[PDB]
Design a protein around this ligand. Structure first.
Ligand SMILES: CCn1cnc2c1c(=O)[nH]c(=O)n2Cc1ccc(CNS(=O)(=O)c2ccc3c(c2)CCCC(=O)N3)cc1
Length: 127
């Protein structure tokens, strides 16, 4: 019935950083996924109410979406690339867990994940 509050994108008690890797994650990785024709279901938190996705937040207790990731990067929320990569992987995994294998939304996530891995293969060394 109700949706939970979306994930935080900034916190005044969590230290903030910019790194060249995090800049690549925003400017190259996130933007490359975001343009994809299959990105739109992943661009905002799941509205379980409007999507009619039964039990979404009964099953998924660590929701994540690319809009949240984008805003985290914009706000210097991540300390390191591993934290950001983990959020992408949580987003994909949530899709694989909630939906049935082979579902069209799963095909979309798999296409985005393949592309994500292409792009992170080229993550620069830290400056
Ligand atoms: C990712 C969060 N999220 C947002 N909407 C979500 C979810 C979720 O987890 N589960 C869901 O069923 N939902 C609803 C939902 C949202 C969207 C869709 C997919 N609609 S489509 O793009 O026109 C489409 C149609 C045919 C098709 C594909 C994609 C896959 C590739 C080509 C292919 O062979 N078949 C199907 C279900």
């Amino acid at each position: 019935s109700m949706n939970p509050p979306p994930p935080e994108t900034s916190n005044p008690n969590k230290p903030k950083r910019q790194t060249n890797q995090l800049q690549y994650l925003l400017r190259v990785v996130l933007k490359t996924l975001w343009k994809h024709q299959f990105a739109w279901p992943f661009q905002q938190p799941v509205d379980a109410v409007k999507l009619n996705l039964p039990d979404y937040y009964k099953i998924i207790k660590t929701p994540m979406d690319m809009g949240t990731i984008k805003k985290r990067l914009e706000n210097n929320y991540y300390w390191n690339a591993q934290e950001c990569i983990q959020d992408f992987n949580t987003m994909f995994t949530n899709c694989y867990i909630y939906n049935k294998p082979g579902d069209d939304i799963v095909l979309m996530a798999e296409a985005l994940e393949k592309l994500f891995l292409q792009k992170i293969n080229e993550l620069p060394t830290e400056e």
